[PDB]
Amino acid sequence: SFDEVML
Amino acid sequence: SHMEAVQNRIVEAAERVPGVRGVIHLRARYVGQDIWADMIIGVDPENTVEQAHEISEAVQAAVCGKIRRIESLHVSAEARE
Amino acid sequence: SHMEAVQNRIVEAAERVPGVRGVIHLRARYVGQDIWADMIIGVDPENTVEQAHEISEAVQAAVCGKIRRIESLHVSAEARE
Amino acid sequence: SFDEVML
């Protein structure tokens, strides 16, 4: 996901 | 790392948009050869919420316009000065 | 190929310099992770040779300023229109 | 060289 990408 | 060069371009593109008082925060990541990024810009505390939204959308268009590998960019605004 | 993206940036940077009437020619190559490029710009045939030299130098500075991987850039000018 | 680079 986007939030998951942001790590 | 070639990510630093991309981050510089994002910051410099955002900073040329009227009403941007600096980039408060920027996180960028690669998803394959695309960039996904999340940014916070500073704005005049006395701007309206609607104006801050407009400046945000302007940054989104400008940054995406200049840096073609960006496929997702979220911009939010916070008061600065 | 990521060279196309760099070539677009060079062309667009040159074209924003006052007195540039298009990029006539551009050849770019990698030397390691640096770019070496040779460009011909169009200018007003009625400009002086000295003015064309000034516009060339302006392009060189602008393009190198925007595209940090460029380590050698030659710019020459030819009449256009 | 530069001219040689230009291929």
Swiss-Prot record, chains B, C:
Disulfide bonds: none annotated. One of its GO terms (cellular component) is plasma membrane. Induction: Part of the probable 17 gene mamAB operon. Fe cation 1 binds at D38, H74. It comes from the Bacteria. The keyword Iron applies. Fe cation 2 binds at H53. The C-terminal domain (CTD) is probably responsible for hetero- and homodimerization; it assumes a V-shaped, dimeric metallo-chaperone-like fold that can open and close. Val-49 forms the hinge between the dimers. Binds up to 3 divalent metal cations (probably iron in vivo); upon binding there is a conformational shift to a tighter dimer. If the CTD cannot fold correctly the function of the whole protein is decreased, suggesting the CTD confers functionality on the transmembrane domain (TMD), perhaps activated by ligand binding to the CTD. This is Magnetosome protein MamM. It comes from Magnetospirillum gryphiswaldense (strain DSM 6361 / JCM 21280 / NBRC 15271 / MSR-1). The gene is mamM. The chain holds residues 215 to 292 of 318 of the full protein.
